[PDB]
Amino acid sequence: NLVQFGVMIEKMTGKSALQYNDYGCYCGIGGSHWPVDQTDWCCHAHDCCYGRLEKLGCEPKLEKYLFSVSERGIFCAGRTTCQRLTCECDKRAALCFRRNLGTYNRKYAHYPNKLCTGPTPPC
Ligand SMILES: Cc1c(C(=O)C(N)=O)c2c(OCC(=O)O)cccc2n1Cc1ccccc1-c1ccccc1
Numbered sequence: 001n002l003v004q005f006g007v008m009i010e011k012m013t014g015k016s017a018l019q020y021n022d023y024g025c026y027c028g029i030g031g032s033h034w035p036v037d038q039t040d041w042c043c044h045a046h047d048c049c050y051g052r053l054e055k056l057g058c059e060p061k062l063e064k065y066l067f068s069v070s071e072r073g074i075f076c077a078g079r080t081t082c083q084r085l086t087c088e089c090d091k092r093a094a095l096c097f098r099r100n101l102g103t104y105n106r107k108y109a110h111y112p113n114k115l116c117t118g119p120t121p122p123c
């Protein structure tokens with residue numbers, strides 16, 4: 001249930017959400033081994049963020065939230081704390097994506113999972 005997160009990605013990066021699915025070793029469902037670059041670390045951190053929310057009793061993969069973007073930044077909202085927490089994880093990730101746009105490399109979109117090697121860093 002991630003059309004809102006995709007919308008946030010596009011608003012913050014100028015790229016389609018498609019460009020962040022399968023990116024490196026962590027962007028897209030699950031993920032393992034060592035992140036390829038800073039954008040991939042964003043996704044590793046986002047996965048960690050969701051894990052924390054699942055241990056709080058939230059379902060961040062499913063939560064529907066509200067948000068806006070002014071010049072003052074990203075404003076998160078929602079009826080429940082779990083929806084607002086989900087928005088906060090997404091926000092940190094979208095901001096992280098924007099921040100590392102300088103090292104975004106297209107060779108890592110749709111990265112073959114066999115090329116993911118090394119240890120898996122902890123959260
Ligand atoms: C960037 C990203 C994700 C991450 O931020 C991440 N850390 O793995 C992500 C994702 O991560 C959450 C998780 O695995 O806990 C699950 C599914 C798609 C994901 N995507 C791609 C994505 C995001 C929003 C809307 C659509 C898509 C998407 C685009 C094309 C095909 C499939 C999904």
Ligand SMILES: [Ca+2]
Nearest residue numbers: 026028030031
């Ligand atoms: Ca992931």
Ligand SMILES: [Cl-]
Nearest residue numbers: 045046049092
């Ligand atoms: Cl985080």
Ligand SMILES: [Cl-]
Nearest residue numbers: 064078079080
């Ligand atoms: Cl609701």
